[PDB]
Amino acid sequence: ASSFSKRWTITVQSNEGTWTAVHDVGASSDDGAVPAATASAVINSLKTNLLAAGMPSDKVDTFGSYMFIKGLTNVVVSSDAGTTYARWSNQSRVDEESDLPAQLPASANGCMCRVGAASTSATWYRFDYATRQWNEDSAYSSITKITNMPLEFAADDQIIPRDFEGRLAGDDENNEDPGFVENGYITGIAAFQGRLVLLSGSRVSMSASGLYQRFYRSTVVNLLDTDRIDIGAASAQDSVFRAALQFNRDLVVFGDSMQAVIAGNAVLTPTNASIALTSEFSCDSRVIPVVTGQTVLYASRRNSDYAGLLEFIPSAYTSSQYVSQDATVHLPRYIPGRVMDMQVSSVTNVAFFRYSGERTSVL
Amino acid sequence: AQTLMENPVSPDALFSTYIERGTDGRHLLINTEAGIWQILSKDATTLIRSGQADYLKASIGATSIQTASIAGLTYILNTEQTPVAHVDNTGKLNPANTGFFYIVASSFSKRWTITVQSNEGTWTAVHDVGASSDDGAVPAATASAVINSLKTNLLAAGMPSDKVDTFGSYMFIKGLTNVVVSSDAGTTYARWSNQSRVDEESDLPAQLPASANGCMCRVGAASTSATWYRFDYATRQWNEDSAYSSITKITNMPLEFAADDQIIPRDFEGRLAGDDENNEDPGFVENGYITGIAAFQGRLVLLSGSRVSMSASGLYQRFYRSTVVNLLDTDRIDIGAASAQDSVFRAALQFNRDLVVFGDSMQAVIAGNAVLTPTNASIALTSEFSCDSRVIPVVTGQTVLYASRRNSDYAGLLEFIPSAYTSSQYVSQDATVHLPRYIPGRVMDMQVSSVTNVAFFRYSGERTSVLVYEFLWGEDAKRAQGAYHKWVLPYDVLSLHTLSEAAYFFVRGPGAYVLALRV
């Protein structure tokens, strides 16, 4: 807003120096006061006073009633004028989203501001001069793109790498890195209901529903559904998840010394997503378990020189209770080495297992 | 190969536990008498001989040391060590000695006034600005000029010059005792702090001079819990922080076993938001004792005298609420359970999908079917039966086998049968009824070889012997085989732990070193 009998002032402080610009506009009765009381004239006069104060001319740009300060080190824009007439950024922090300028000059095509009331998580916004609108974006110096991701087998019979999206909103405090970014290892992949699953060291990460390459929260204002899911589970021994399987209606995640089930009866959101261990039994989770008939058959090592198979019996009364009993008890010394592969022919009710003991044989 | 670890004088003073680190593993080995930790390869080869730590010294060994591995981190806990809390008000200023006055709007025909009252004295500054027609009125009506004139009037009133600082239109008052900044001007023109209390977060100055790098203010509408904010001059922003004189860091916490084979202490975070009224101390801070550790889904569990405390999801060292405005999920969890007898929780176990917490005279289960938040976190007892919870129970087959004392001179084992119909119903029945006088003393250790369906128990009765359990679960959850034979070793056993294929026995060597026996 523009007033008549007001002294306009602005202070700019940074590592380079502190500059103060003061402009005085007279009452409406003064000659040439109505033209000089406009916001554009006041902004131009303030910029001229800032330049005369000693600040370099290559540090301030303006288009209309909006002034942009760039090229400093720790710039903190303030003003002694009232809050009902002018708005400033301080340390790129505004009260609410309505305070964003959305009309900055062309010199500001990447300006970043934080919207909050000093009691909210860091919510960052970026300015796009092309559309004169502010879009949510991750903070400065954040992960934007991750390569070396699993490759893609598209409709055309070609395997090509596909880059995965980085952080898209907030910072590492409210939008934390998923399991496979904080830990450099990825151990197993799966495809649950609409989301890609990337197990990484006892941490389960599920991408967005519609977007399989988005493993970061797309917004920070509200914890949206159909968004990133990042959950973890503790164990008596520091084992990691290696194989995940999609059973009747639940996602069963297997590990070297721990087995867990993820309920899938209802649609899972980041608010209600949780993982709980079922049994911490020794397992050869390196090989993908296969559903045989009505049960899951996964490998195990009963000795350093022999292997075995365990059956993951589902309860016939409760929806998501599972009990595991050994199926190859009567064959202790029958599978030399370790199990290398599992396959099931669902039409003939037969299963084939390839083990490292005899290369020319198959169970 | 015989380890380079010296023999422990006490019969029960050695603690061993296998840790899997990728495709390779390690054999943690701790001598409780001297605290001399030791790390071995997968088969009898020391990697880094961890130096002795006074934290690992305990009067009773092999049973006061508990371990819990979460993510790639492993924490070693000693239950005979009391954590100590530190209160370090380093970057926080005293709220009772600070105040501020900010000017929001400037008027012309207004009398500007401010009053500052404290134990030292009461000071009032009055500045008058004339109408716009007056000579030199537009320059003098600016907020900066008004603030400077008010500061000059305050100094002339008698208040020392070393108590007020200002940068722009913001005034800061420091160095008093019970400073209460007020103003007779309207609320639409100026803002004051009173007793460091503002209406909402928007009223915070965020532009105080450099002299205020730790100013504390409370945001509330006189009907909300104490929410404190701290000012950082470097970023000119206000960040949530705990109140003055609050626990900031707690030492003597369980040590850390990082990816590198070294055991080092790790300090735990203190209070980060609010005060002790809305952000209460967890179980292990209000009570100086810590009894048992566990790692539930994403959170570290620190049982402390019938109180279960779970850290934040992403941060295992944060046992305090990070914010007070809203009860955020994936945050601190602090719950408790009452009992007929004042027993404490000692051992927690992660069963199929639920966390079972055991105690000397009480057993409880924490549901884990759905993700647990501080809003919906609760613990309910299942059965208040006598238990030797000092030893960690182990899952055998489809059930949990935990120790108990049927007599002052003999022990026993109880089976924690899970219901086959309901998700989280458990019934416990004694499993060693047919062997009353068969386990002299008390059970010292439990281990299970999940690949061979065998379990080994070490008891204090015969030091050279070891109890063996063989199990085989058939259809319809019917125990097809139950065996309770006994084994005898030439040397007294100190500790034992199982691996993917073999179980390692650590016996008392005839010389001055313990031997690692595998089978």
PDB file of N, CA, C and O in Angstrom, chain B residues 206-244:
ATOM      1  N   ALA B 206      12.335 -11.535  14.699  1.00  0.00           N
ATOM      2  CA  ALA B 206      13.194 -12.114  13.670  1.00  0.00           C
ATOM      3  C   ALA B 206      14.197 -11.117  13.099  1.00  0.00           C
ATOM      4  O   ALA B 206      14.836 -11.405  12.080  1.00  0.00           O
ATOM      5  N   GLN B 207      14.354  -9.948  13.725  1.00  0.00           N
ATOM      6  CA  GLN B 207      15.327  -8.963  13.266  1.00  0.00           C
ATOM      7  C   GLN B 207      16.002  -8.274  14.452  1.00  0.00           C
ATOM      8  O   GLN B 207      16.358  -7.093  14.375  1.00  0.00           O
ATOM      9  N   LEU B 208      16.174  -8.992  15.557  1.00  0.00           N
ATOM     10  CA  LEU B 208      16.808  -8.416  16.729  1.00  0.00           C
ATOM     11  C   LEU B 208      18.294  -8.166  16.462  1.00  0.00           C
ATOM     12  O   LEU B 208      18.895  -8.816  15.602  1.00  0.00           O
ATOM     13  N   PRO B 209      18.906  -7.225  17.179  1.00  0.00           N
ATOM     14  CA  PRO B 209      20.330  -6.943  16.966  1.00  0.00           C
ATOM     15  C   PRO B 209      21.203  -8.129  17.355  1.00  0.00           C
ATOM     16  O   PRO B 209      20.746  -9.135  17.903  1.00  0.00           O
ATOM     17  N   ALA B 210      22.498  -7.987  17.060  1.00  0.00           N
ATOM     18  CA  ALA B 210      23.448  -9.067  17.296  1.00  0.00           C
ATOM     19  C   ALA B 210      23.588  -9.412  18.772  1.00  0.00           C
ATOM     20  O   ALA B 210      24.028 -10.519  19.099  1.00  0.00           O
ATOM     21  N   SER B 211      23.226  -8.494  19.671  1.00  0.00           N
ATOM     22  CA  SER B 211      23.324  -8.756  21.101  1.00  0.00           C
ATOM     23  C   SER B 211      22.349  -9.823  21.577  1.00  0.00           C
ATOM     24  O   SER B 211      22.496 -10.312  22.701  1.00  0.00           O
ATOM     25  N   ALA B 212      21.365 -10.189  20.762  1.00  0.00           N
ATOM     26  CA  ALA B 212      20.369 -11.197  21.111  1.00  0.00           C
ATOM     27  C   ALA B 212      20.574 -12.400  20.195  1.00  0.00           C
ATOM     28  O   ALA B 212      19.980 -12.488  19.119  1.00  0.00           O
ATOM     29  N   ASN B 213      21.429 -13.326  20.623  1.00  0.00           N
ATOM     30  CA  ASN B 213      21.667 -14.561  19.889  1.00  0.00           C
ATOM     31  C   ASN B 213      21.066 -15.778  20.574  1.00  0.00           C
ATOM     32  O   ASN B 213      21.210 -16.893  20.064  1.00  0.00           O
ATOM     33  N   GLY B 214      20.405 -15.597  21.713  1.00  0.00           N
ATOM     34  CA  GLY B 214      19.796 -16.702  22.422  1.00  0.00           C
ATOM     35  C   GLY B 214      18.475 -16.326  23.057  1.00  0.00           C
ATOM     36  O   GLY B 214      18.025 -16.980  24.002  1.00  0.00           O
ATOM     37  N   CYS B 215      17.854 -15.261  22.555  1.00  0.00           N
ATOM     38  CA  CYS B 215      16.606 -14.780  23.130  1.00  0.00           C
ATOM     39  C   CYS B 215      15.526 -15.850  23.045  1.00  0.00           C
ATOM     40  O   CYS B 215      15.373 -16.524  22.024  1.00  0.00           O
ATOM     41  N   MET B 216      14.778 -16.003  24.133  1.00  0.00           N
ATOM     42  CA  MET B 216      13.746 -17.023  24.246  1.00  0.00           C
ATOM     43  C   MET B 216      12.390 -16.357  24.425  1.00  0.00           C
ATOM     44  O   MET B 216      12.248 -15.434  25.233  1.00  0.00           O
ATOM     45  N   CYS B 217      11.401 -16.828  23.670  1.00  0.00           N
ATOM     46  CA  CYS B 217      10.041 -16.324  23.769  1.00  0.00           C
ATOM     47  C   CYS B 217       9.074 -17.498  23.752  1.00  0.00           C
ATOM     48  O   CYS B 217       9.362 -18.548  23.174  1.00  0.00           O
ATOM     49  N   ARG B 218       7.925 -17.311  24.394  1.00  0.00           N
ATOM     50  CA  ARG B 218       6.892 -18.333  24.480  1.00  0.00           C
ATOM     51  C   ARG B 218       5.704 -17.905  23.631  1.00  0.00           C
ATOM     52  O   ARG B 218       5.172 -16.805  23.812  1.00  0.00           O
ATOM     53  N   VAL B 219       5.293 -18.771  22.712  1.00  0.00           N
ATOM     54  CA  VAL B 219       4.170 -18.506  21.821  1.00  0.00           C
ATOM     55  C   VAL B 219       2.943 -19.211  22.382  1.00  0.00           C
ATOM     56  O   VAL B 219       2.950 -20.435  22.565  1.00  0.00           O
ATOM     57  N   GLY B 220       1.897 -18.448  22.659  1.00  0.00           N
ATOM     58  CA  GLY B 220       0.677 -19.024  23.182  1.00  0.00           C
ATOM     59  C   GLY B 220      -0.379 -17.955  23.357  1.00  0.00           C
ATOM     60  O   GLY B 220      -0.082 -16.755  23.403  1.00  0.00           O
ATOM     61  N   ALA B 221      -1.624 -18.418  23.455  1.00  0.00           N
ATOM     62  CA  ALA B 221      -2.778 -17.549  23.651  1.00  0.00           C
ATOM     63  C   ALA B 221      -3.366 -17.697  25.051  1.00  0.00           C
ATOM     64  O   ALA B 221      -4.585 -17.645  25.226  1.00  0.00           O
ATOM     65  N   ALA B 222      -2.506 -17.898  26.049  1.00  0.00           N
ATOM     66  CA  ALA B 222      -2.850 -18.073  27.458  1.00  0.00           C
ATOM     67  C   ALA B 222      -3.693 -19.315  27.714  1.00  0.00           C
ATOM     68  O   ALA B 222      -4.195 -19.483  28.831  1.00  0.00           O
ATOM     69  N   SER B 223      -3.867 -20.194  26.724  1.00  0.00           N
ATOM     70  CA  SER B 223      -4.633 -21.423  26.898  1.00  0.00           C
ATOM     71  C   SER B 223      -3.961 -22.608  26.215  1.00  0.00           C
ATOM     72  O   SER B 223      -4.635 -23.584  25.872  1.00  0.00           O
ATOM     73  N   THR B 224      -2.647 -22.542  26.010  1.00  0.00           N
ATOM     74  CA  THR B 224      -1.898 -23.596  25.346  1.00  0.00           C
ATOM     75  C   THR B 224      -0.694 -23.975  26.195  1.00  0.00           C
ATOM     76  O   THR B 224      -0.250 -23.213  27.058  1.00  0.00           O
ATOM     77  N   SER B 225      -0.174 -25.171  25.941  1.00  0.00           N
ATOM     78  CA  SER B 225       1.019 -25.632  26.636  1.00  0.00           C
ATOM     79  C   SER B 225       2.219 -24.770  26.262  1.00  0.00           C
ATOM     80  O   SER B 225       2.262 -24.152  25.195  1.00  0.00           O
ATOM     81  N   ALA B 226       3.200 -24.727  27.164  1.00  0.00           N
ATOM     82  CA  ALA B 226       4.372 -23.878  26.981  1.00  0.00           C
ATOM     83  C   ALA B 226       5.160 -24.275  25.741  1.00  0.00           C
ATOM     84  O   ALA B 226       5.774 -25.346  25.700  1.00  0.00           O
ATOM     85  N   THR B 227       5.149 -23.415  24.725  1.00  0.00           N
ATOM     86  CA  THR B 227       5.896 -23.621  23.490  1.00  0.00           C
ATOM     87  C   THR B 227       6.967 -22.543  23.409  1.00  0.00           C
ATOM     88  O   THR B 227       6.649 -21.356  23.273  1.00  0.00           O
ATOM     89  N   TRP B 228       8.228 -22.950  23.488  1.00  0.00           N
ATOM     90  CA  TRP B 228       9.345 -22.021  23.535  1.00  0.00           C
ATOM     91  C   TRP B 228      10.036 -21.933  22.182  1.00  0.00           C
ATOM     92  O   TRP B 228      10.104 -22.911  21.431  1.00  0.00           O
ATOM     93  N   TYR B 229      10.547 -20.743  21.876  1.00  0.00           N
ATOM     94  CA  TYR B 229      11.260 -20.483  20.637  1.00  0.00           C
ATOM     95  C   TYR B 229      12.564 -19.759  20.942  1.00  0.00           C
ATOM     96  O   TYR B 229      12.638 -18.947  21.867  1.00  0.00           O
ATOM     97  N   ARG B 230      13.590 -20.059  20.151  1.00  0.00           N
ATOM     98  CA  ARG B 230      14.907 -19.461  20.309  1.00  0.00           C
ATOM     99  C   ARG B 230      15.287 -18.718  19.037  1.00  0.00           C
ATOM    100  O   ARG B 230      14.916 -19.119  17.930  1.00  0.00           O
ATOM    101  N   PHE B 231      16.038 -17.633  19.203  1.00  0.00           N
ATOM    102  CA  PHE B 231      16.407 -16.759  18.097  1.00  0.00           C
ATOM    103  C   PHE B 231      17.846 -17.018  17.682  1.00  0.00           C
ATOM    104  O   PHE B 231      18.751 -17.018  18.523  1.00  0.00           O
ATOM    105  N   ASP B 232      18.056 -17.231  16.385  1.00  0.00           N
ATOM    106  CA  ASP B 232      19.381 -17.438  15.813  1.00  0.00           C
ATOM    107  C   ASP B 232      19.721 -16.222  14.961  1.00  0.00           C
ATOM    108  O   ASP B 232      19.129 -16.018  13.897  1.00  0.00           O
ATOM    109  N   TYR B 233      20.673 -15.417  15.434  1.00  0.00           N
ATOM    110  CA  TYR B 233      21.023 -14.186  14.731  1.00  0.00           C
ATOM    111  C   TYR B 233      21.657 -14.465  13.375  1.00  0.00           C
ATOM    112  O   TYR B 233      21.561 -13.632  12.467  1.00  0.00           O
ATOM    113  N   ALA B 234      22.307 -15.620  13.219  1.00  0.00           N
ATOM    114  CA  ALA B 234      22.982 -15.926  11.962  1.00  0.00           C
ATOM    115  C   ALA B 234      21.996 -16.017  10.804  1.00  0.00           C
ATOM    116  O   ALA B 234      22.273 -15.523   9.704  1.00  0.00           O
ATOM    117  N   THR B 235      20.844 -16.643  11.028  1.00  0.00           N
ATOM    118  CA  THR B 235      19.843 -16.821   9.987  1.00  0.00           C
ATOM    119  C   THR B 235      18.652 -15.886  10.136  1.00  0.00           C
ATOM    120  O   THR B 235      17.763 -15.900   9.280  1.00  0.00           O
ATOM    121  N   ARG B 236      18.613 -15.077  11.198  1.00  0.00           N
ATOM    122  CA  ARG B 236      17.512 -14.146  11.447  1.00  0.00           C
ATOM    123  C   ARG B 236      16.168 -14.871  11.468  1.00  0.00           C
ATOM    124  O   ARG B 236      15.161 -14.374  10.960  1.00  0.00           O
ATOM    125  N   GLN B 237      16.153 -16.060  12.060  1.00  0.00           N
ATOM    126  CA  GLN B 237      14.954 -16.876  12.148  1.00  0.00           C
ATOM    127  C   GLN B 237      14.813 -17.423  13.560  1.00  0.00           C
ATOM    128  O   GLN B 237      15.796 -17.559  14.292  1.00  0.00           O
ATOM    129  N   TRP B 238      13.575 -17.732  13.935  1.00  0.00           N
ATOM    130  CA  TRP B 238      13.267 -18.282  15.248  1.00  0.00           C
ATOM    131  C   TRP B 238      13.021 -19.778  15.126  1.00  0.00           C
ATOM    132  O   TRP B 238      12.178 -20.212  14.335  1.00  0.00           O
ATOM    133  N   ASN B 239      13.755 -20.560  15.909  1.00  0.00           N
ATOM    134  CA  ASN B 239      13.657 -22.012  15.891  1.00  0.00           C
ATOM    135  C   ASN B 239      13.125 -22.513  17.225  1.00  0.00           C
ATOM    136  O   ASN B 239      13.452 -21.963  18.281  1.00  0.00           O
ATOM    137  N   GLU B 240      12.295 -23.552  17.168  1.00  0.00           N
ATOM    138  CA  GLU B 240      11.773 -24.153  18.387  1.00  0.00           C
ATOM    139  C   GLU B 240      12.909 -24.746  19.209  1.00  0.00           C
ATOM    140  O   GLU B 240      13.830 -25.365  18.672  1.00  0.00           O
ATOM    141  N   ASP B 241      12.842 -24.553  20.523  1.00  0.00           N
ATOM    142  CA  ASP B 241      13.872 -25.069  21.412  1.00  0.00           C
ATOM    143  C   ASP B 241      13.270 -25.268  22.794  1.00  0.00           C
ATOM    144  O   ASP B 241      12.243 -24.678  23.137  1.00  0.00           O
ATOM    145  N   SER B 242      13.931 -26.110  23.584  1.00  0.00           N
ATOM    146  CA  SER B 242      13.480 -26.383  24.938  1.00  0.00           C
ATOM    147  C   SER B 242      13.669 -25.157  25.824  1.00  0.00           C
ATOM    148  O   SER B 242      14.463 -24.259  25.531  1.00  0.00           O
ATOM    149  N   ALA B 243      12.925 -25.130  26.926  1.00  0.00           N
ATOM    150  CA  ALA B 243      12.970 -23.999  27.838  1.00  0.00           C
ATOM    151  C   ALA B 243      14.330 -23.917  28.529  1.00  0.00           C
ATOM    152  O   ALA B 243      15.158 -24.829  28.454  1.00  0.00           O
ATOM    153  N   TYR B 244      14.552 -22.796  29.209  1.00  0.00           N
ATOM    154  CA  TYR B 244      15.804 -22.585  29.921  1.00  0.00           C
ATOM    155  C   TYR B 244      15.952 -23.595  31.053  1.00  0.00           C
ATOM    156  O   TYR B 244      14.974 -23.994  31.692  1.00  0.00           O
TER     157      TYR B 244
END
